[PDB]
Design a protein around this ligand. Structure first.
Ligand code: PC1
Ligand code: 3PE
Ligand code: 3PE
Ligand code: 3PE
Ligand code: 3PE
Ligand code: LMT
Ligand code: LMT
Ligand code: LMT
Ligand code: LMT
Ligand code: LMT
Ligand code: LMT
Ligand code: LMT
Ligand code: LMT
Ligand code: LMT
Lengths: 345, 142, 171, 48, 83, 98, 115, 120, 172, 105
């Protein structure tokens, strides 16, 4: 696409969440959700082949249906209270329908089946955008109404998302699905702590973003979609194995990496509220994430899979990637646990 | 709402007494899980017919009902033969009978073992939860 | 919870101004410049009080002056007035601009006979000040007392005692 | 009408406040003929 | 500065619809800036009295608020009669 | 007003059922997403008129503005789905299971 | 009420002429009369098959421009505002981006029908 | 938690009253660890690009160290203020509701009977 | 005339029931026109005017395009009509039975709260400035040019971006 | 909001038409402007949790003005009790309720 289209489309993608985040009125929050939905569509389907077209279609009908449900909440609330914002007096069922619709937009299970497939049909950089920047708008709405959310709905969604994300990711050889199920599981953690401490949902989002960004950038370095494709990194970009491994352990919540901090503080704050049972199952199923992250580490940095003859040409050539952002996000996403007290508050 | 009242009839009277009332409740409770399971089952992994669809709903709901009826009986029977109401070991015996029933209906000795242990422990922790007042979904305090 | 207080049907009895809209509209400009003080006090009562039951006296003086105003025209300029509003009535929007010739005759009757000057363009829409001895209401909305604010916390910032106090971190 | 209805306070308001609340059309023409009510709801909007 | 005239003559010959469209578009953005009447558009709209001019209580410190509408004070629409 | 919102709200539910219960054509599911926009617009319009809130009447127009864009973007996608398989049947969009 | 009456009267006339047209003539139905028309030969295929739309891009661009009419139709009320500078500036920009959007599509061969 | 407290300016990074708090020491263990996180980044950058890890691009390495210490200094100053505010609000609350945080007299062990648990 | 609004909302409901059963998009586009028209008449009954005619205008141009797309992309040999299939014909009939039941039921257990059949018409217009002049919905919608100019920026940008969005989506 | 930018810049993009009692074109009050203006002033500065209990009087009145549940209930009871009397034959409406008043003015 020509530079005018990129400027218009990339500005609109950026504009959406900023409108949702800066808006007092609910209809303007909805408007920002529409900008993101509309402008991402051309980006997703740019390569125009049978798979990205299905991906851009499944995404549209999912996110448009969820939009209509959110709008119904915004309108039933204006009927009940004559105002364009949710109040303590807003009907209970109005809030729950907003929650289910937004979770449908985030990809939280059981409204999750679309996310792994859409992430699979699109290029890596748009998976990065979809799994990161596109989550801030629905989440910023939820953080604005956390005093009102029914915790029983939120915890069932979070428990479901942590389980389904673990089980789903355990069966995947496609990296883009492993990233989608990774996302689903982490959204479970952000959502579980939402009605209690919304600040910890922002900590878990930010740490997830700076872990998920370099991971995509790492796969975008050689355009590697499979476990066998990523297994050739020792013979292609061996300098990358040291930080891919840590980021994967960091995404797994293993100490003493930055990714342990979000799970650990969420568990700590959940049990300040006596949320013992939910917290225990959440931490016990987060163990399953580490297993299929460990399996990836086995295939890439801790063993050498067979390589092919044509990869010798690849070595004669010179790469201009990755950029200075990959190194900055790799270190901060793994070696920042000793700064934990400065991140929570 | 009534349907909530019915499921709270299960804890008005000390365990081991009003045995059939409890067995009825956990039998309905198991059926509700079986119906919810079938709904997802038929919708996500659809069958080749429509009778074959309904058969799977019946097979899941009776199996789920059977587990609930064997749990709610074995728990109440054990809880009065031993004359030990406030006791998690009762719910471990009932939960395992539930697990045994699951394996019996599934033609799988392995499921019976896993079901006897996993469900017995889950049932015991439910009892220990009510004694100590653990809440599944607490409300925000801090 | 309370019993709404309503005036009795004999508190609401006045002499009505039973004339059609064209009759009012034909006499509207002079009437605005003749019954102004009486009219301007009822409106002040109505916006100040926000209650129709509290101005059932100023509003009967509105009918008092409206009827006097018409009695002065039914005794000096009956026929010039009747030709004018009868011609204003014909139009479907009762527009002044189709009767500038009858209008002139009615103006040149009140002016000479009664001294009445038609207000210019823009004068009837001015915001005037009205003098009245009615007390100013102080709680027109019958509002309760606003609940107290949460008391503020006084003091200057000091460093947090023993730092962040986050698990084993010292600083 | 409601002399002999237990616990009926004739003229009772529905508002805690004692401010004057203008009545609705339904409160106002509700005990009159339906023609009056239809007029108030559609009199202006149906005149053409 | 010399080639443009050649282009404009060229477009004017073979594309007058667009040359007329740009001119009228751009002439509509200049005319408000330079007309000596653009200021009255707001004034006339402000001088049209839809709502009732609710009178104010005369405390006693209102020396520039008319008592009667036919007073020599207050906003005047002479500029509109003679417009 | 009470009876109207109930009928309008149930109208929205029927279209949400229509959207969530696919048949063959993707175009038919697009028309249900317009049944929902129409129900929401009529609710908002009646709410604003009943309460005399003129400042909220811009909002129903924006709903139509941001509903057309979806209809346009939805129809644009339906062209790409037809250019691939020659119909708009949803059952064809299933490559991504693997 | 009048506007409802006049339109039922219109509908009843259109209905009444429809009934007379069908029950007055003498009708002789047979298969070869009631087949579809195609210049004297049998149709080679049903008329319900897909019919490619060579102007589809303009069709959906009509929708976007159709809603931009819905934004300009309040103008007759809008020129009654005190904030004339604002009303005018918003109006100029709105029409100008519709024009800028139209120019982009025109230059991208978007108004051209697909061959 | 503290989002809507009184006097809370919106999107103000370091409010004025933070200036009454002592600044972070320049060689703070927390700032110094930022300097090392910057240095490693410069080393990781050279590794990923296939350059001499320590010899290459010292201008970059210097600017990675400076950037992280500079940002860490101001970020640290903000967290000190947020932590100072937390105590400030916490203690002033204790004062305004004394009946809710009663001082308690704790008996001495002479008067307490801790049960004895033999280890046989 | 006291049942007038109730009937319009009842017709609107069916139009969306027929639409939800999803026959050929030729008829689904016919239900949206009749629901669009019915819904237009509701906004008129409640006192609207500009909002009534706009939603009718906009949905007239949308179904024109949708018709062009149906004949090109969503047409099969034997288009389905509401009577075409016995199963759909069952749920259209049954769907109308349910509303006659839900309205009658819910009217029995509250009598006023939701459906107040006893008092249809009494509660349509609540208040109305009887001596007003400036009250048309057009004046409220026209506030986008002065007071809620933000509404128009996002609306204009939405449409402006959309042209760029569709040209790229459909590009070869 | 989540990023109080409008409040920081001191502008108002959408803050000025949040509720009924907001400014309307040509100074036309909204229905229940009096009640809402009371409720928003009651619950101002005390926070949401305090306001839910300490401004319950203002809110329940605004909720009644907006939705009129009690008003319709009450007028339903008067009309239904009159229906019962008239069927028995113990009440005939006045002339001014049966379409024969002497109209005012
Ligand atoms: C104007 C036309 C109205 C009069 C003709 C109505 C035709 C009709 O229905 O005939 C009665 C019908 C016969 O309809 P029909 O099939 O004979 O209608 C044809 C009309 N003609 C005879 C002029 C060709 O009588 C019946 O048997 C059923 C009643
Ligand atoms: C909140 C932000 C969430 C992250 C959203 C991702 C935004 C970036 C979108 C993208 O396309 O990422 C890929 C981007 C392209 O850059 P590159 O890989 O070097 O290839 C083309 C350059 N010639 O490569 C990048 O530079 C990605 C950098 C991500 C920055 C994350 C900051 C946190
Ligand atoms: C609350 C959160 C909602 C619950 C999560 C829904 C997940 C639904 C799901 O993934 O089910 C898929 C599964 C596949 O069905 P199937 O393979 O045929 O069953 C076994 C065949 N021998 O279908 C199943 O059989 C799973 C059984 C149902 C589990 C979800 C409902 C449990 C509620 C009790
Ligand atoms: C490579 C292989 C070796 C792996 C080593 C793994 C290290 C794991 C570290 C886990 C976190 C423990 C250190 C964090 C800490 O609590 O240090 C607090 C430190 C306090 O300052 P300090 O001078 O050290 O003592 C008190 C006087 N201020 O102040 C700080 O916060 C300093 C933080 C930087 C720690 C270095
Ligand atoms: C990893 C396992 C270690 C766990 C324990 C964490 C503490 C060890 C890291 C020590 C780093 C350090 O403290 O250097 C900063 C130093 C300022 O230290 P200071 O504030 O004066 O007193 C603190 C005494 N612990 O200032 C300096 O002198 C550092 C400058 C030279 C750095 C090279
Ligand atoms: C990426 C964000 C940063 C850039 C910010 C946006 C400003 C961009 C300025 C550079 C603009 C160049 O963008 C310019 O676009 C036009 C269409 O508009 C393209 O031109 C296109 O249309 C013209 C119309 O005559 C035809 O020649 C042809 O169909 C095609 O080339 C140019 O090839 C490109 O040079
Ligand atoms: C305020 C406005 C904010 C603007 C925000 C801008 C965010 C930055 C966007 C970066 C986009 C560039 O990122 C994207 O890079 C990838 C490579 O990874 C390119 O993607 C590429 O994928 C593969 C191989 O990589 C090629 O076969 C393909 O043809 C090409 O598109 C995209 O063409 C480019 O768009
Ligand atoms: C009081 C304690 C009582 C303990 C018993 C209760 C637990 C019973 C568990 C039964 C578990 C499954 O039960 C067992 O399933 C097998 C499946 O191999 C079935 O067995 C039958 O079919 C299998 C095929 O699957 C054949 O290989 C087998 O030879 C045949 O007998 C029967 O159904 C039963 O033999
Ligand atoms: C201190 C050490 C203690 C050691 C304890 C040893 C006690 C073992 C008792 C187990 C008895 C039940 O025996 C059970 O046999 C079945 C044989 O089908 C095994 O299970 C196997 O068959 C089942 C069918 O039932 C299938 O699901 C599957 O092929 C496999 O799991 C179980 O894993 C085992 O649990
Ligand atoms: C087969 C293995 C399964 C292991 C679990 C065994 C389950 C058997 C026990 C049946 C429990 C019936 O479930 C019943 O749910 C209700 C729902 O309100 C609980 O109710 C409880 O929580 C609600 C919250 O909504 C409180 O308001 C209420 O005061 C309290 O009683 C009952 O305490 C519990 O007894
Ligand atoms: C209950 C009365 C109240 C009104 C009920 C109607 C509400 C609106 C429902 C709209 C959805 C119709 O729901 C319908 O579900 C059926 C399965 O039953 C599915 O339809 C699919 O299977 C059926 C059954 O063989 C086929 O006839 C149909 O052609 C096929 O597409 C579709 O997903 C959806 O078209
Ligand atoms: C990105 C798209 C941009 C392309 C479109 C750009 C359109 C820009 C239009 C600028 C024209 C505004 O023109 C401006 O009009 C206003 C009012 O109309 C005039 O303003 C004048 O009249 C108003 C009332 O009408 C008085 O209250 C004011 O005091 C006086 O200055 C300005 O003197 C003139 O400069
Ligand atoms: C597309 C299909 C559309 C068909 C929609 C249905 C049309 C018919 C409307 C049914 C709605 C109720 O219709 C009618 O309402 C009135 C008042 O409004 C009810 O009530 C009426 O009778 C009651 C006594 O029963 C009295 O209080 C009074 O005379 C009146 O209120 C009637 O009992 C009911 O017959
Ligand atoms: C980076 C992406 C965003 C860039 C594009 C958007 C730029 C903003 C353009 C829209 C500007 C709207 O500008 C905003 O208008 C509103 C009303 O319209 C004004 O707000 C005004 O509203 C009404 C006017 O009757 C008054 O009651 C109120 O007190 C006053 O603030 C704001 O003071 C002004 O800031």
């Amino acid at each position: 696409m020509n530079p005018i289209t990129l400027a218009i489309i990339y500005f609109t993608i950026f504009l959406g969440p900023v409108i949702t985040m800066s808006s007092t009125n609910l209809m303007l929050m909805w408007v920002g959700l529409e900008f993101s939905l509309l402008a991402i569509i051309p980006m997703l389907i740019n390569k125009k082949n049978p798979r990205s077209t299905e991906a851009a279609t499944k995404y549209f009908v999912t996110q448009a249906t969820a939009s209509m449900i959110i709008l119904l909440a915004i309108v039933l609330n204006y009927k009940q209270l004559g105002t364009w914002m949710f109040q303590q007096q807003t009907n209970g069922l109005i809030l729950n329908m907003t929650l289910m619709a937004l979770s449908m937009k985030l990809g939280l299970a059981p409204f999750h089946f679309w996310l792994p497939e859409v992430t699979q049909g699109i290029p890596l950089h748009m998976g990065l955008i979809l799994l990161t920047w596109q989550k801030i708008a629905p989440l910023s709405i939820l953080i604005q109404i956390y005093p009102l959310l029914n915790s029983t709905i939120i915890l069932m969604l979070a428990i479901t998302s942590i389980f389904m994300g673990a089980w789903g990711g355990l069966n995947q050889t496609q990296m883009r699905k492993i990233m989608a199920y990774s996302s689903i599981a982490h959204m479970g953690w952000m959502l579980a702590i939402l009605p209690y401490n919304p600040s910890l949902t922002l900590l878990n989002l930010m740490i997830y973003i700076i872990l998920t960004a370099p991971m995509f950038m790492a796969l975008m370095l050689n355009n590697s979609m499979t476990i066998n494709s990523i297994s050739l990194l020792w013979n292609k970009t061996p300098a990358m194995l040291t930080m891919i491994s840590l980021m994967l352990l960091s995404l797994g919540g293993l100490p003493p990496l930055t990714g342990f901090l979000p799970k650990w503080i969420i568990i700590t704050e959940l049990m300040k509220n006596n949320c013992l049972i939910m917290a225990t199952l959440m931490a016990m199923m987060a163990l399953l994430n580490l297993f299929f992250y460990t399996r990836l580490i086995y295939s890439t940095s801790l063993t050498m899979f067979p390589t092919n003859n044509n990869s010798k040409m690849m070595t004669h050539q010179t790469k201009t990637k990755p950029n200075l952002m990959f190194s900055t996000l790799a270190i901060m996403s793994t070696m920042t646990l000793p700064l934990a007290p400065q991140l929570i508050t | 709402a009534m349907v909530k009242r019915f499921f709270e009839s299960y804890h008005e009277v000390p365990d081991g007494t009003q045995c059939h009332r409890k067995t009825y409740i956990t039998t309905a409770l198991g059926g509700i899980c079986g119906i919810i399971g079938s709904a997802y089952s038929v919708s996500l992994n659809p069958a080749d017919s429509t009778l074959e669809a309904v058969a799977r709903v019946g097979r899941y709901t009776f199996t789920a009902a059977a587990i609930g009826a064997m749990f709610g009986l074995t728990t109440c029977v054990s809880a009065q033969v031993r004359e030990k109401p406030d006791d998690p070991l009762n719910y471990f015996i009932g939960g395992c009978a539930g697990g045994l029933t699951l394996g019996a209906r599934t033609h799988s000795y392995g499921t019976a073992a896993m079901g006897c242990v996993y469900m017995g422990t889950a049932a015991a922790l439910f009892k220990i939860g009510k004694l100590e007042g653990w809440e599944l979904f607490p409300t925000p305090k801090v | 919870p309370g019993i709404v207080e309503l005036p009795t049907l004999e508190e609401l009895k006045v002499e009505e101004v039973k004339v059609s809209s064209a009759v009012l509209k034909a006499a509207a400009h002079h009437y605005g410049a003749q019954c102004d003080k009486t009219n301007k006090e009822f409106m002040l009562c109505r916006w100040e009080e926000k209650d129709p039951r509290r101005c059932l006296k100023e509003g009967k003086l509105v009918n008092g002056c409206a009827l006097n105003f018409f009695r002065q025209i039914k005794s000096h300029c009956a026929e010039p007035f009747t030709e004018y509003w009868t011609c204003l009535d014909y139009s479907n929007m009762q527009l002044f601009r189709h009767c500038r010739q009858q209008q002139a005759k009615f103006d040149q009757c009140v002016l000479d006979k009664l001294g009445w000057v038609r207000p210019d363009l823009g004068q009837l829409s001015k915001v005037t000040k009205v003098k009245t001895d009615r007390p100013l209401p102080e709680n027109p909305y019958h509002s309760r007392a606003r609940p107290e604010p949460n008391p503020v916390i006084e003091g200057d910032l000091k460093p947090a005692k023993h730092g962040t106090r986050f698990f084993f971190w010292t600083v | 009408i409601m002399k002999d209805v237990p616990n009926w306070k004739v003229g009772e308001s529905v508002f805690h406040t004692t401010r004057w609340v203008p009545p609705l059309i339904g409160e106002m023409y509700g005990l009159r003929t339906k023609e009056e009510m239809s007029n108030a709801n559609f009199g202006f909007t149906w005149y053409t | 500065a010399g080639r443009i005239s050649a282009f404009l003559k060229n477009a004017w010959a073979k594309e007058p619809v667009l040359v007329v469209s740009f001119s009228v578009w751009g002439l509509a953005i200049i005319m408000p800036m330079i007309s000596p009447y653009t200021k009255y558009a707001s004034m006339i709209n402000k001088a049209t009295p839809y709502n009732y001019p609710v009178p104010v209580r005369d405390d006693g410190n209102m020396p520039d608020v008319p008592s009667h509408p036919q007073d020599p004070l207050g906003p005047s629409l002479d500029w509109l009669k003679n417009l | 007003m009470p009876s109207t919102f109930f009928n309008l709200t149930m109208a929205f539910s029927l279209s949400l059922l229509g959207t969530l219960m696919f048949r063959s054509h993707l175009m038919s599911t697009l028309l249900c997403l317009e049944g929902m926009v129409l129900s929401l617009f009529i609710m908002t319009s009646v709410t604003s008129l009943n309460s005399n809130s003129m400042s909220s009447m811009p909002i129903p127009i924006t709903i139509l503005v941001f509903a057309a864009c979806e209809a346009a973007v939805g129809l644009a996608l339906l062209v790409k789905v037809s250019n691939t398989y020659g119909t708009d049947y949803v059952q064809n969009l299933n490559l991504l299971q693997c | 009420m009048n506007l409802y009456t006049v339109i039922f009267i219109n509908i009843l006339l259109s209905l009444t002429l429809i009934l007379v047209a069908f029950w007055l003539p003498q009708m002789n139905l047979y298969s070869e009369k009631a087949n579809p028309y195609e210049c004297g030969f049998d149709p080679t295929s049903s008329a319900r098959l897909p019919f490619s739309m060579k102007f589809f891009l303009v069709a959906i661009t009509f929708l976007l421009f159709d809603l931009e009419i819905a934004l300009l139709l309040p103008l007759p009320w809008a020129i009654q505002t005190i904030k004339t500078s604002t009303m005018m500036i918003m109006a100029f920009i709105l029409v100008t981006i519709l024009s800028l959007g139209l120019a982009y599509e025109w230059t991208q061969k978007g108004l051209e029908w697909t061959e | 938690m503290m989002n809507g407290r009184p006097g809370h300016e919106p999107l103000k990074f370091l409010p004025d009253e933070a200036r009454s708090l002592p600044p972070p020491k320049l060689n703070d263990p927390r700032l110094v660890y930022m300097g090392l996180l910057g240095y490693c980044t410069g080393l990781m950058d050279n590794m990923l690009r296939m350059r001499p890890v320590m010899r290459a691009g010292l201008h970059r390495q210097l600017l990675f160290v400076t950037s992280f210490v500079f940002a860490g200094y101001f970020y640290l100053k903000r967290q000190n203020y947020l932590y100072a505010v937390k105590d400030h609000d916490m203690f002033g609350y204790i004062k305004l509701h004394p009946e809710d945080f009663p001082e308690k007299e704790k008996k001495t062990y002479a008067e307490i009977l801790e049960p004895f648990h033999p280890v046989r | 005339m006291n049942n007038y609004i109730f009937v319009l909302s009842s017709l609107f409901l069916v139009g969306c029931l027929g639409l939800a059963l999803k026959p050929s998009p030729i008829y689904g586009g016919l239900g949206l026109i009749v629901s669009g028209f019915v819904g237009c008449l509701m906004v008129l009954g409640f006192g609207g005017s500009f909002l009534g005619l706009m939603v009718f205008l906009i949905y007239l141009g949308g179904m024109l395009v949708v018709f062009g797309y149906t004949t090109a992309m969503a047409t099969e040999e034997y288009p389905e009509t509401w009577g075409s299939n016995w199963l759909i014909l069952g749920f259209l009939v049954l769907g109308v039975i349910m509303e006659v039941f839900l309205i009658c039921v819910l009217n029995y257990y509250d009598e006023v709260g939701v459906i107040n059949l006893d008092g249809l018409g009494d509660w349509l217009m609540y208040e109305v400035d009887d001596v007003g002049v400036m009250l048309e919905g057009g004046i409220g919608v026209a506030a986008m040019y002065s007071c809620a100019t933000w509404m128009m920026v996002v609306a204009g940008w939405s449409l402006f971006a959309g042209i760029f969005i569709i040209i790229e989506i459909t590009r070869d | 909001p989540f990023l109080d930018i409008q409040k920081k810049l001191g502008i108002s993009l959408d803050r000025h038409f949040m509720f009924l009692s907001a400014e309307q074109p040509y100074k036309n009050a909204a229905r229940c402007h009096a009640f809402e203006k009371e409720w928003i002033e009651c619950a101002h500065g005390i926070g949401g949790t305090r306001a839910k209990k300490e401004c319950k009087i203002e809110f329940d009145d605004f909720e009644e003005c907006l939705l009129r549940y009690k008003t319709m209930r009450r007028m339903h009871d008067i009309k239904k009790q009159r229906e019962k009397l008239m069927k028995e034959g113990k009440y005939t409406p006045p002339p001014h309720h049966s379409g024969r008043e002497e109209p005012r003015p």
